Amino acid sequence: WQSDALKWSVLGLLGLLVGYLVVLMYAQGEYLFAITTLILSSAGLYIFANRKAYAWRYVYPGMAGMGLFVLFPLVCTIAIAFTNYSSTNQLTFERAQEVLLDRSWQAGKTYNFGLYPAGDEWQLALSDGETGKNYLSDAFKFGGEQKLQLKETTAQPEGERANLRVITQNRQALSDITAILPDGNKVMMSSLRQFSGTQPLYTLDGDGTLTNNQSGVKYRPNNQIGFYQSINWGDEKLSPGYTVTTGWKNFTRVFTDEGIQKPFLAIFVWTVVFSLITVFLTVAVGMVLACLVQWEALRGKAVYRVLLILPYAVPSFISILIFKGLFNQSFGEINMMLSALFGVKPAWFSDPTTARTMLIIVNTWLGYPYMMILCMGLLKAIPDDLYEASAMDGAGPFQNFFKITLPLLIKPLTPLMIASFAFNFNNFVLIQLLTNGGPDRLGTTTPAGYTDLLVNYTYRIAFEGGGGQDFGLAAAIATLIFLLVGALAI
Amino acid sequence: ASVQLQNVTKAWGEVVVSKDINLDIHEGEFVVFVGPSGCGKSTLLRMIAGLETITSGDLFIGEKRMNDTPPAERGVGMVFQSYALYPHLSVAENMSFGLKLAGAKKEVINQRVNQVAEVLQLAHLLDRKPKALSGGQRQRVAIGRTLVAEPSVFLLDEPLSNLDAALRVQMRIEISRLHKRLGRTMIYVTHDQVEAMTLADKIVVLDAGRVAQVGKPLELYHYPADRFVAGFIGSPKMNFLPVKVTATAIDQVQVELPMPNRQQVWLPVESRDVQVGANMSLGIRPEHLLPSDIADVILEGEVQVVEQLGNETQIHIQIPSIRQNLVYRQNDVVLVEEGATFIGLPPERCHLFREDGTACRRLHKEPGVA
Amino acid sequence: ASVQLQNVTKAWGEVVVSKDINLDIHEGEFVVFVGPSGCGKSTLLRMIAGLETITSGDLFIGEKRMNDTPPAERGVGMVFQSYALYPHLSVAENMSFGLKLAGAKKEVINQRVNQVAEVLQLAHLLDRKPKALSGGQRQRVAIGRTLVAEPSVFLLDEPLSNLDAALRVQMRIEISRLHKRLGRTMIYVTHDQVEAMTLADKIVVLDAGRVAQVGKPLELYHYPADRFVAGFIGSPKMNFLPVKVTATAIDQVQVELPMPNRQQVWLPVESRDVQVGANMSLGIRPEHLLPSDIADVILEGEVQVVEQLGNETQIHIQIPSIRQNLVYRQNDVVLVEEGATFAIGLPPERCHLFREDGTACRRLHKEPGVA
Amino acid sequence: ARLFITHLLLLLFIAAIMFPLLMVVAISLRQGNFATGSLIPEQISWDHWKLALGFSVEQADGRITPPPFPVLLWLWNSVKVAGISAIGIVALSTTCAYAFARMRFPGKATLLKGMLIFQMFPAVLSLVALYALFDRLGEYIPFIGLNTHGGVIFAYLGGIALHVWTIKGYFETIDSSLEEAAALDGATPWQAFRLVLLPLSVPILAVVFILSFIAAITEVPVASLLLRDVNSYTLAVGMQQYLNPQNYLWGDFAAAAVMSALPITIVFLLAQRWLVNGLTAGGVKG
Amino acid sequence: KIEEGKLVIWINGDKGYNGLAEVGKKFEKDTGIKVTVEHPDKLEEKFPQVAATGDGPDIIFWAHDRFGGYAQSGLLAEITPDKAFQDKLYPFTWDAVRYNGKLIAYPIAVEALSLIYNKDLLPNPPKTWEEIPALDKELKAKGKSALMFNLQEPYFTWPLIAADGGYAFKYENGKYDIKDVGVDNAGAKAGLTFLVDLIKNKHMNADTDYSIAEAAFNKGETAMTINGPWAWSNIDTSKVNYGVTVLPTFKGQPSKPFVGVLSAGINAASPNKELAKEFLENYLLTDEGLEAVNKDKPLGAVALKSYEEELAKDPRIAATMENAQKGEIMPNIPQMSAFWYAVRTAVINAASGRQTVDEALKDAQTRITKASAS
Ligand SMILES: CCCCCC/C=C/CCCCCCCCCC(=O)O[C@H](COC(=O)CCCCCCCCCCCCCCC)COP(=O)(O)OC[C@@H](O)CO
Numbered sequence A: 001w002q003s004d005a006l007k008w009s010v011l012g013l014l015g016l017l018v019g020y021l022v023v024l025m026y027a028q029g030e031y032l033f034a035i036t037t038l039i040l041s042s043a044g045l046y047i048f049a050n051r052k053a054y055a056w057r058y059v060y061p062g063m064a065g066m067g068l069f070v071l072f073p074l075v076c077t078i079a080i081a082f083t084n085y086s087s088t089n090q091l092t093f094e095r096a097q098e099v100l101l102d103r104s105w106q107a108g109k110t111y112n113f114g115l116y117p118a119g120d121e122w123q124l125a126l127s128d129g130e131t132g133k134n135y136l137s138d139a140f141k142f143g144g145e146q147k148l149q150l151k152e153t154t155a156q157p158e159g160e161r162a163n164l165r166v167i168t169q170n171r172q173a174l175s176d177i178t179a180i181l182p183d184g185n186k187v188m189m190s191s192l193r194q195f196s197g198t199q200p201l202y203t204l205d206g207d208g209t210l211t212n213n214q215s216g217v218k219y220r221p222n223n224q225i226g227f228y229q230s231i232n233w234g235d236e237k238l239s240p241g242y243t244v245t246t247g248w249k250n251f252t253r254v255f256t257d258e259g260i261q262k263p264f265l266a267i268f269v270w271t272v273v274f275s276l277i278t279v280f281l282t283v284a285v286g287m288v289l290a291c292l293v294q295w296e297a298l299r300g301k302a303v304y305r306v307l308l309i310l311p312y313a314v315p316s317f318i319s320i321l322i323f324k325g326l327f328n329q330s331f332g333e334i335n336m337m338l339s340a341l342f343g344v345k346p347a348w349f350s351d352p353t354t355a356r357t358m359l360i361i362v363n364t365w366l367g368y369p370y371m372m373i374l375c376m377g378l379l380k381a382i383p384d385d386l387y388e389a390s391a392m393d394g395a396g397p398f399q400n401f402f403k404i405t406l407p408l409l410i411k412p413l414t415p416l417m418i419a420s421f422a423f424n425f426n427n428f429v430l431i432q433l434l435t436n437g438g439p440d441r442l443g444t445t446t447p448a449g450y451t452d453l454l455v456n457y458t459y460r461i462a463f464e465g466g467g468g469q470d471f472g473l474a475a476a477i478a479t480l481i482f483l484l485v486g487a488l489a490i
Numbered sequence B: 001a002s003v004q005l006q007n008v009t010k011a012w013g014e015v016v017v018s019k020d021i022n023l024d025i026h027e028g029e030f031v032v033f034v035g036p037s038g039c040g041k042s043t044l045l046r047m048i049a050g051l052e053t054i055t056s057g058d059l060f061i062g063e064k065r066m067n068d069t070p071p072a073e074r075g076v077g078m079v080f081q082s083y084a085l086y087p088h089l090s091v092a093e094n095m096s097f098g099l100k101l102a103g104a105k106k107e108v109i110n111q112r113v114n115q116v117a118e119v120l121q122l123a124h125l126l127d128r129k130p131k132a133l134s135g136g137q138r139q140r141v142a143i144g145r146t147l148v149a150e151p152s153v154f155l156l157d158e159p160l161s162n163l164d165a166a167l168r169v170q171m172r173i174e175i176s177r178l179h180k181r182l183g184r185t186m187i188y189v190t191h192d193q194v195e196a197m198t199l200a201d202k203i204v205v206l207d208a209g210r211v212a213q214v215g216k217p218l219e220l221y222h223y224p225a226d227r228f229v230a231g232f233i234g235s236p237k238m239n240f241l242p243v244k245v246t247a248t249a250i251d252q253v254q255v256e257l258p259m260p261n262r263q264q265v266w267l268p269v270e271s272r273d274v275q276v277g278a279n280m281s282l283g284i285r286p287e288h289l290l291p292s293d294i295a296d297v298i299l300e301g302e303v304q305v306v307e308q309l310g311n312e313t314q315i316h317i318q319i320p321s322i323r324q325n326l327v328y329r330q331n332d333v334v335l336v337e338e339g340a341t342f343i344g345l346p347p348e349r350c351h352l353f354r355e356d357g358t359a360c361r362r363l364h365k366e367p368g369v370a
Numbered sequence C: 001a002s003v004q005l006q007n008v009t010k011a012w013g014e015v016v017v018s019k020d021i022n023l024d025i026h027e028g029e030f031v032v033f034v035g036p037s038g039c040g041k042s043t044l045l046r047m048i049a050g051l052e053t054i055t056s057g058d059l060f061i062g063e064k065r066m067n068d069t070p071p072a073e074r075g076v077g078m079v080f081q082s083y084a085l086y087p088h089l090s091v092a093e094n095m096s097f098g099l100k101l102a103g104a105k106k107e108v109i110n111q112r113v114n115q116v117a118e119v120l121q122l123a124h125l126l127d128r129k130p131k132a133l134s135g136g137q138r139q140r141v142a143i144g145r146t147l148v149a150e151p152s153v154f155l156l157d158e159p160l161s162n163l164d165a166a167l168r169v170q171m172r173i174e175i176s177r178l179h180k181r182l183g184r185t186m187i188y189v190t191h192d193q194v195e196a197m198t199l200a201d202k203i204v205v206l207d208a209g210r211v212a213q214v215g216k217p218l219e220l221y222h223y224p225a226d227r228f229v230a231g232f233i234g235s236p237k238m239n240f241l242p243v244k245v246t247a248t249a250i251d252q253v254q255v256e257l258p259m260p261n262r263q264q265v266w267l268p269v270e271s272r273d274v275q276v277g278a279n280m281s282l283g284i285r286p287e288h289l290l291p292s293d294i295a296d297v298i299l300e301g302e303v304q305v306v307e308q309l310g311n312e313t314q315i316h317i318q319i320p321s322i323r324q325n326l327v328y329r330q331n332d333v334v335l336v337e338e339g340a341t342f343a344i345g346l347p348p349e350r351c352h353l354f355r356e357d358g359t360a361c362r363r364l365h366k367e368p369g370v371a
Numbered sequence D: 001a002r003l004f005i006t007h008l009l010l011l012l013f014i015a016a017i018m019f020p021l022l023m024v025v026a027i028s029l030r031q032g033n034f035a036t037g038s039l040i041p042e043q044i045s046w047d048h049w050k051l052a053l054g055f056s057v058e059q060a061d062g063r064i065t066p067p068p069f070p071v072l073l074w075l076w077n078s079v080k081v082a083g084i085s086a087i088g089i090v091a092l093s094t095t096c097a098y099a100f101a102r103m104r105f106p107g108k109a110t111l112l113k114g115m116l117i118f119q120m121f122p123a124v125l126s127l128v129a130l131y132a133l134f135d136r137l138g139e140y141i142p143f144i145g146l147n148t149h150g151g152v153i154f155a156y157l158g159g160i161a162l163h164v165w166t167i168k169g170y171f172e173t174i175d176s177s178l179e180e181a182a183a184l185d186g187a188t189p190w191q192a193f194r195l196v197l198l199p200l201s202v203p204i205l206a207v208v209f210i211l212s213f214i215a216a217i218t219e220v221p222v223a224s225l226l227l228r229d230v231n232s233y234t235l236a237v238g239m240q241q242y243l244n245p246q247n248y249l250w251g252d253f254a255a256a257a258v259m260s261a262l263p264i265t266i267v268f269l270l271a272q273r274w275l276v277n278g279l280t281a282g283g284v285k286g
Numbered sequence E: 001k002i003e004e005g006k007l008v009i010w011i012n013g014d015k016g017y018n019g020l021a022e023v024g025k026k027f028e029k030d031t032g033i034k035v036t037v038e039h040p041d042k043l044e045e046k047f048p049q050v051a052a053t054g055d056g057p058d059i060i061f062w063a064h065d066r067f068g069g070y071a072q073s074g075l076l077a078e079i080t081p082d083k084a085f086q087d088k089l090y091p092f093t094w095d096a097v098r099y100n101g102k103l104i105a106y107p108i109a110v111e112a113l114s115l116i117y118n119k120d121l122l123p124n125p126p127k128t129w130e131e132i133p134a135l136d137k138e139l140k141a142k143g144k145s146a147l148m149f150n151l152q153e154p155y156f157t158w159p160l161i162a163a164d165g166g167y168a169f170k171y172e173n174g175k176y177d178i179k180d181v182g183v184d185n186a187g188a189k190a191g192l193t194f195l196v197d198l199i200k201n202k203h204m205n206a207d208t209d210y211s212i213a214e215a216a217f218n219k220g221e222t223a224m225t226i227n228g229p230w231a232w233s234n235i236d237t238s239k240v241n242y243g244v245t246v247l248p249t250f251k252g253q254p255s256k257p258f259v260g261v262l263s264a265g266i267n268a269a270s271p272n273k274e275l276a277k278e279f280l281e282n283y284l285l286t287d288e289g290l291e292a293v294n295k296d297k298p299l300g301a302v303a304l305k306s307y308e309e310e311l312a313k314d315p316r317i318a319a320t321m322e323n324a325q326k327g328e329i330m331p332n333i334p335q336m337s338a339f340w341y342a343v344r345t346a347v348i349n350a351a352s353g354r355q356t357v358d359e360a361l362k363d364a365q366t367r368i369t370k371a372s373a374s
C-alpha cells in the first residue's frame, strides 16, 4: 500500500504547478486565463484535500471539461451578443488604430534604385524615369537611421550592381535611409526595387484625433458605432471599423423589425413539428429494430445488426446530397421508380408538404441508427425473467412490447428524446443542403422558405442578407433560440 | 391437461441434469416433485413450461407434442422459485397481468384479484411496488399472479418456502381447496415433507437427474425402492447400519449386527438375489425405534447430541462399532445429557438394502398402503 | 460483538414497522428472530447492518453508537434473504470477494474458500456463475460468502429456506459448531421451528413491529406470555377454546368448558387479574392432548380432516359449541375415517389460559427443562 | 410464420436503407468525378481507390500520377483521435454518472438539468472561443495546443452531459442490494464502482463508446480549426480537400467516405461482446 | 504575430500548389527567404479570423469577390504596382481588385463560363440563343437534346439574364452603388422570360442541376452544356470529341457570365510586404512562374498578357478569355450575399411556375435593396 505522506506529496507537486503557472500567466498580459486557471485548480485541490468533498471527486473532472468546452464557448457567444462584432467591425480598437497608422499615400516621385559597392562601403543610385535624370550618393555604411545627400550624375558608379540577395539581406538598414534629392525632396525605400516619396496617410495627435496628411480632414473615434469619423461630426467614416459594446441593440433588432417577424410563427410551428416527428419516427424504428435484432429466433441477426447501422457509419454530408439527387422531381431513381410502378411523380421540391415529407424521410434514415444503438444498450437492462414471467402470463411479442419493453425504456429514453428534439430544432445543415429552405414563402421582404427552420431563416439575415457577417446579431439570436428551446424542454 | 414426459433428457453441454425421465401425469392429478437441492426439479418444471429446451425425448401436454411450442402457447402458469415480479407494477397489477392479456373484463378481474388477495393476506398491500414488500409478501404476489390467471396446468416451484408456519398451514389448505374446485393438473415442487405428504396424489423422488421412485406418500414412506429414497423421504433421516447376511429363508432374511455381541435377527424381507456373507445396509427410522423395556433386540450406546424440540426430544446415540450416530425420537421433553448411557430394534420395521443400494421388498404389511 | 437496540423505531412515512424495540444481545449469544411474514425481521437486520436508516432510537455495536456509521465499519456480515450474489462472478469469486478487498494472502483465501465449500457441498460448483445454479445452491453461496468473511456479528436472513430436509439438518449442525468454535454473536432469522429450537440461546418473537416476548426455546414453548406467542411458537398451532371462569385461588383458576355438559376444571394457573364470569381462552397443544382412555376431561366430536405424515397422524376434530376444529397429533399411522366420532383427553396441567386482552395467566405447573 | 414475415420485411427495409449507400460506393468506382449515374457504373475505374490506398495511377498519356494525399495516414489519425477520445468520454461520463446515481450532494438535480440545458445551446460562434482557448493553452502546455491531436481530443471531452444521463439511467436499473453486499464486504465506493457496478453496466458503456467514436470519426469543424499539418489531418478533415467552390472530386470523396465507415463497422462489431443480455441474472431473488 | 523574414502563402487545394512551391524555391535561391505554401480547408473562412488578430499568411490566393470584405475589415494592404507593371495585365482584371478606389490584390487567373459542345453531334455551334429551339427539334428526333445546364444556381443562368441589360450592382466609375440594382429592369425580364419559355416548350427541364447536366453531356445525350474550365478533365476521361467556344448571343447582345479573378492579396499585418511584392511581381507573374504553376495544375486563362497569348493557342482558353472580356466582373461588395439568394429564389419561382417572370424579379430586387439599406 502507498504511504499517507505520498498523498500530500502528490498534492504538493500539483500545488507547485498552480502558482508557478498562475504568476507566469499574470505576466505579459493573460488576465482572463489567470483568473480561470486559479478558481478551477483551487476547486480541484480542495476537493481532493478533504474527505467531506468525496462525491465531488467523481464529478469535478467531467465538469471541468464541460466548463472549458461547453460553458466557456456559451458565455463568449452571449458576451459577443452585446457587441457590434461583425465583418464591418471585426478588429479591436488597438488593431484598427494600428492598421490606419500603417496606411500611406504617394506624396512625391518614384525612383528605381540600385546598390553599388564602394570598397567596404556602399553607394545608392536613383533613377528618375520622367526626366531621364540619375542620382548617386556618397559612400556609406549600413546601420541605423541615417540621411544621404544625392548628387545628380551623368556618370556610372564604379562597383558592380548588387544582386537581389544583398538587397534582401540588408533590407532593414536600407529601409532606415532617408535619401534627399538636390531639389530638396525626401525619399525612402518603398520596395526592394524602388525609393519613393511615400508618407504616412495619418498622424496620431495624443488626445485621440487622427489627421489626414493629404486632405487635412480630422478624425475622432466614435465609440457608439465603432468607427473613426470626420469632425461635431461630419459624415465620412474610416474603415476598418472596430468592435464596441452596443448593449441590447442586437436583441431589440429582433423584437422591433416587423420584416423579420412576419414568418416567425409559421416557421416556429414547422420546426417544432419537424423535430417532434423526427424524434417519434427515429425512436419507433430504432426500438423495433433493436428488439428484432436481439431476438434469439432470428438466424441472421448478427449480419442485420451491422447493415442497419451503416447509414450512421458514412458521414451525413455526402448522404444528404445523394438524397438531393435521389429525390429530384424529373430525374433521380425514386420518381423514375414511382413512374414505372404507381404512375406518380411527387413534387419533392415544388410542393411545401411533399418537401416537408422528403425532409422527414431523410432525417429518419439519418436518425434511426442513433436511437437503435441506444435501445440496443438500454434493452439489456431489462431482466430476462420478466419475459419468462410474461410468457407464463400468456404474453406474445406485441403484448411484451407495450406492457414490458416500452414502459421500462421510456424513462431512460426521455432525456435523450428531449435532447434529440433540441438538436433537430436547430438542424441547420439538413435544410440548407437538401432544400435551401425551399420552396419560397411569397411576400416575405426578409426572405423565408417553407422548410426553413428558425435556425436557417435567421442565419440568412445575419450572414447573408447583404450586410457582411453580423456575428453580434447571430449571437443574440442564438441566445434567444436557446431560451426558447430551454423553455419548451420544461 | 395431462402431462407426459417420455425419455426426457437435459444436458448443459456435458453435465447431464435430467436423465431419461419418464412421467405420466393424468389430468387433474396433484403431483409433487421432491429431491435434494440441485437434483433437477426446477429444470423439469422449466422444460414443461418451455423456458428451457429439451435435449432429447418428448413432452406432451393435452395430447399435443410441446417440445417446439413457445412457452406462452402451452397453457401453463408458473410460480417461479425466485418470484420474478414486475418491478414497475404494483401488487394488484402484477396479480391481474395474465387476465388483462386474456381478455380484460375489468369487473371480473377486480373480483378475482380481491378474492385471491384476501386468501393470501395481501389485501392491504395492493398499491405497493415489489421493492416495498417483505420476502414472503413477494412470494405470495408470485402465487397470486398465477392463481388469478387459472392456467390449464399449474406449476409451483417451492412456493411456501419463506412463509411463517401458521400462514404456511393456511396456504396448504387453500391450494388443496383450489385443486378440488378446479380439477386442473398441478405440478408442485417442495422441500417441506409435510407439504409433500398432505398435498400429493403422487410423489416423484428425483435423484441427480433420474426418477428414483414414483408412488403414493405412504407407499414411499413404508416401501422405499432403494437406499436413496429411504434416506430422503422422512426427516430426521432413516438410520443405516452395516450388516452381514448370515442365512436366507423363504419369506425372510437373517442378518448379523456389527456390535461386539454379534446378535442375529430375522427380518421379514424378500430373499430374491440375497447372498450369504454379503454386506448389506439395515434401515430403521428414528420414530420406529422402541424403548428398551419393550423390545427383544437391544442396542446400547453413548448419548452425543440432545435436541429439545418441545413436543419431542431427538437423541443422537453413538454405538460402538457403528461409525454413524443413531438418531432416536421420543415424545415429550426427555431430560438426558451428553455422555450418558442410553433403545429397541423392531425386526418387522427394518429395511434392508443391497450393496448397489436397491431394497429387499418388505413383506410386513403396514397400514395406509393398498 | 454485542448488539444493543434502545427504543429503535422505523417508519416509511406513516407506515411504522418497528415500534420502540428494546433488545439486548450479549457477546457470543446465538439469537433467533421469529415472527409472521411481514413483521419487520429483515428491517431490523438491515438497520443493524446499516443498509436502512434508523428513524429514532439508538443502535449500539460493541458498546459503540452505530446509527450513522457506514456499513463497512460496523463489523457486520449478512446472508441476505434475496441472496444478493454478484451475478458476474463465479461461486469462488463470490465467496472470496471480501478477502480480495482486504489484504488477505492468496493462500489463506484459497484455503478457507475450499473448506467452507466442502461443508456447504459446493466444491464441484466453484467455477459456476449464479445463473448456472439452482436456488438452493445460490442460497448456500450466500451463506458461504459470509462464513468465509467471519465477521464480528453474523446476520442470517432465512438462510436454510430453500434447502432439502437432509441438507438443512447438515447446515444446521455446521452453523451450530461454527458458533461454538468462534464464540461470536449470531443473529438468525427463520420460519423453521426446528432451527429456532435447536440453534438459539434465546428467541425473539416479533409481532407487527413490536417485541412480543424474549426467552429461551423451552421457556417460550412452555410459558408463552400471550395468545399471539402461544399460537406462533409450535406447529401445528396451539388449539384455543373459549371458557368461563367459575372460581379462583391465588394458585389456580376454575374454568367451565363450552360444551353442553359444562364440565369444570381447575387449572394450575395464576389468578392475577382474573374475575369470576370473565371470558377467557384456554390453550392446549395438539401433542399435549391425551388418548381418551387415560383422561378425566373428555372432549368428543366428529373427524373432519385426517393427515397421514408417516411418523404420525394429525386428526382435525369438530367439537359442538366450538367454532374452530381441534387438532390432535397421534404417533404412527392411525386409520380414522372422516365423519367418525373421536374422543380425546384434556389434561389440566398442560392447559394455557389467556385473558380478554390476550395476556397469559402464568402457568404454575413446573415443566422439565426450564429453570 | 412470424420468422418468415420478419426476414422478408427486414430484407426489404435493408434494401431500401442500403440503396443510398450503394450509390456512394458507385461514385467511388466510377471513372472521373460524377455524383450521379447508374448503380453499376457504365465505365468502372479503380483509380480513386488506388490513390486512397497509396498506389500510383497510370493516366491516359503514359504519365504516372503519384497519390496527392496520405489517405491511409488520415484514417490512422482518425482512429487514434476517435479511439482515445471515446475512452476519455466513457471514463469521465461513468465516474460522473456514478456520483449522480449513488451519492448525495447539494444541488444534484439542478446541475443535472443544467448540464443537459447548457449542452443544448447552439454552437454558432463556438469556433472563435475554442481557437482563442487553444492558442492560449499552447504556450503553456504544448501537447494539447493548436496543431496537435491532444488538443483535438481534449476538445471532444466536453460533450459528456447526455452520456452522463444515459449511464445514470442504466445504473438505476441495477438492484441496489449488490452494492449493499459489496459495502458490507468492505468495498469502498470506488471498489464497488469498479468491481461490481461497471461489469454489470457494460452494455451501456459499449453504447457510449460507439456513439462517441462515431461523432469523432465524422467531426469536421473543430478538427479542421485545430490541425494545420497535412500529415496530422483526420480523414474527415483531409477529405475536405476534395471540395471546391464550383466542383467536387466526387470519386475521391466517396472513396474516403466508404473508408471512414470501416473503423466504425469494426468498433460496432467488437462492441457486440459487451452488448449482452442476462448480466444481472441469478443475483437477486425477486 | 506573423514571422518576419519569410513568406507563408495560402492557396486552395485545387490549384497547383506544388508548382507555386517551386517558384518559392527559386525565390529562396535568389533571396535567402524561405517560402511555405499551404492549402488549408475553408481558407477563405480561416483567413478573416487569423488576420484580425495580426496573424495568418503573408499572401492569400482566392477569388477577388471575397477581397472587398477583407479590405473593409482592414486585413489587406493596399498594393502599389507602377504603371509599367499594370500594363502587363489586362485592364479589366484591375477593376476586380479595387476597394475605395485603391488596389488591394494582384490578378492571377481569369474564370468564366463557356459554351461546351460535342463535335460528333454538333460540328457547328450556334452563335445565338434564338437558334437553340430549332436545334433542339432536330436532335429530339434523334433521341437527344440540344442544351442542358444548371438551372438551379443563378451563377449558371445569369449570362442570359444579364445579356439584354441585367446587372447585379452598377459599376459607375470605380465604385459600386448599393441602391442601383438591375435585376428588376427590362433587360433581366427579357433574359428570364426566354429561359422560362425554353422550359415551357420542353426544351429544358426546371429541376436540371449541375450533376445531371454534366452526366448527360459526358455520356453524349446532350449536344451542348454551359460549364467552366474545372469541368474539362472529366470530359477528357470520357474521351468525347469536344470543343469550347464563345457563349451564344441574345437579342444581338453577348452573354454576360460572372467573371471570377483568382487574386493574390497581401495581409495588412505582414512585416514582409516588400518580400511579398517582389515574389508576386517579379517571380510569380512572369511567363516562367505561371508556367510552373500551370504545369502542376492548369490555371485556365491568366491575367498576364504575355503568358495568356501562349496559352490562347489552346482554343478552350481563348474562348474562356473571350467570354470573360464580354462578361460581368463579380462585385466584391458584401451586398452580393443578398443578391445570390434572392436571384436563386426568383429563377426557381419562375421556372417552376410558382411565380411569373415579372413578379419573381420584382420581389428579388425588393429583397436586395432593402437588405442594402437595413
Ligand atoms: C412506423 C414503425 C415501423 C417499423 C419498421 C421496422 C422495419 C422492420 C420490419 C419488421 C416489421 C415487424 C413485423 C412484426 C414481426 C413479429 C415480431 C416478432 O415476432 O419478434 C419479436 C420482436 O419484438 C417486437 O419488435 C414486437 C413488434 C413491435 C410491435 C409492433 C408495433 C410497432 C409500432 C411502433 C410503436 C412505437 C411506440 C412509440 C414509442 C416512441 C420477438 O420478441 P419477444 O419474443 O417478445 O422477446 C424476445 C426477448 O426479448 C425475450 O427474452
Ligand SMILES: Nc1ncnc2c1ncn2[C@@H]1O[C@H](COP(=O)(O)OP(=O)(O)NP(=O)(O)O)[C@@H](O)[C@H]1O
Binding pocket: B131, B132, B133, B134, B135, B136, B137, B162, C012, C015, C017, C035, C036, C037, C038, C039, C040, C041, C042, C043, C044, C081
Ligand atoms: N420501502 C418500504 N415502504 C413501505 N413499507 C415497507 C417498505 N419495505 C418494507 N415494508 C413493509 O414493512 C414490513 C416489514 O418488512 P420486512 O422487515 O421485510 O418483514 P419480514 O419480517 O422480513 N417478513 P418475511 O421476510 O416475509 O419473513 C412489511 O409489512 C413490508 O410490507
Ligand SMILES: Nc1ncnc2c1ncn2[C@@H]1O[C@H](COP(=O)(O)OP(=O)(O)NP(=O)(O)O)[C@@H](O)[C@H]1O
Binding pocket: B012, B015, B017, B035, B036, B037, B038, B039, B040, B041, B042, B043, B044, B081, C131, C132, C133, C134, C135, C136, C137, C162, C164
Ligand atoms: N446453465 C447451467 N449450466 C450447467 N448446469 C446448470 C445450469 N443451470 C442449472 N444447472 C445445474 O443443474 C442442476 C439442477 O438445477 P435445478 O433444476 O435448478 O435444481 P433444483 O432441483 O431445482 N434444486 P433447488 O432449487 O436448490 O431445490 C443443478 O445441480 C445446477 O447446478
Ligand SMILES: OC[C@H]1O[C@H](O[C@H]2[C@H](O)[C@@H](O)[C@@H](O)O[C@@H]2CO)[C@H](O)[C@@H](O)[C@@H]1O
Binding pocket: A278, A279, A282, A316, A363, A364, A366, A367, A368, A370, A419, A420, A421, A423, A424, A427, A430, D215
Ligand atoms: O435525429 C436526426 C439526426 O440524428 C443524428 O444526430 C444525432 C447525432 O449524431 C448525435 O451525436 C447526437 O447529438 O444526437 C443526434 C440525434 O438527436 C444524425 O447524425 C443526424 O444527421 C440526424 O439529423
Ligand SMILES: [Mg+2]
Binding pocket: B041, B042, B043, B081, B157, C134, C135, C136
Ligand atoms: Mg429449484
Ligand SMILES: [Mg+2]
Binding pocket: B134, B135, B136, C041, C042, C043, C081, C157
Ligand atoms: Mg424478511
